[PDB]
Design a protein around this ligand. Sequence first.
Ligand SMILES: O=C(O)CCC(=O)C(=O)O
Ligand SMILES: [Cl-]
Ligand SMILES: [Fe+2]
Length: 280
Amino acid sequence: ALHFLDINATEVKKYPTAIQDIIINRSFDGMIIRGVFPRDTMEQVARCLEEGNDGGMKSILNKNEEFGTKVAQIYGHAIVGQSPDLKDYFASSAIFRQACRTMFQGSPDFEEQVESIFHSLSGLPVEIPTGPEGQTYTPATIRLLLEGREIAVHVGNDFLLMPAANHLKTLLDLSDQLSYFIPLTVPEAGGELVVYSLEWNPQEASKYAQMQEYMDDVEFKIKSNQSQSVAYAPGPGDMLLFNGGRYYHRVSEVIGNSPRRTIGGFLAFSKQRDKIYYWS
Ligand SMILES: O=C(O)CCC(=O)C(=O)O
Ligand SMILES: [Cl-]
Ligand SMILES: [Fe+2]
């Protein structure tokens, strides 16, 4: 059984060990934090993307057409699936940070507001990681799901098995990463985050040839309702923060003409749990 807290952003300082409780204690699995950003700010940013006065965000839009017409588009490169050098990732990350700061117009600033939230929920400093040669990681990416598009089932801790994670693994604790995201725009129907009770299990995955054959068996448990699940659909400006590192999750197919737009990434403890890093 998955357990998600629901509070308004005004209350976050009353939960100073929430991130510790999700990752280490595992007394619960996620939170909906209502109104981290005002509705007007979300609309403003959405309009920037739609009109094109987006601080150069459209210059780093990846349509992902090579992976079919059934997948999310993404502004900025997400680190998952990148080459170990991260050269393209770092280039797009710098642009993403610029454009994001421009669009939010400090009302409130995206990075400041998100860092404020994570700080309140942990009592710890919060930082965007720096690359081997001083490059900035991106704090977030924006995912765009048009009508009929979805995000296939996956689990966050698989990132640790990817070459792209080489550098981050020198900075992060061994524990679970969390996912965080905030809708900019929400669809008419569908586009729900579905989290399953099925957990990350590298011992079972290692007893297969490739990940496609293992994921087929994971898919069979999901399609047969063997695993318990909960669906979430946070509103614009609400943050959804959960143990995506541990639990398999997906975003259901978008229904209607109105696209689902979400800004977010991941977070995890530093080696000594004296700091939180966040990135996408
Ligand atoms: O809906 C999103 O923006 C991303 C969903 C997801 O897989 C995650 O938050 O880790
Ligand atoms: Cl994930
Ligand atoms: Fe995810």
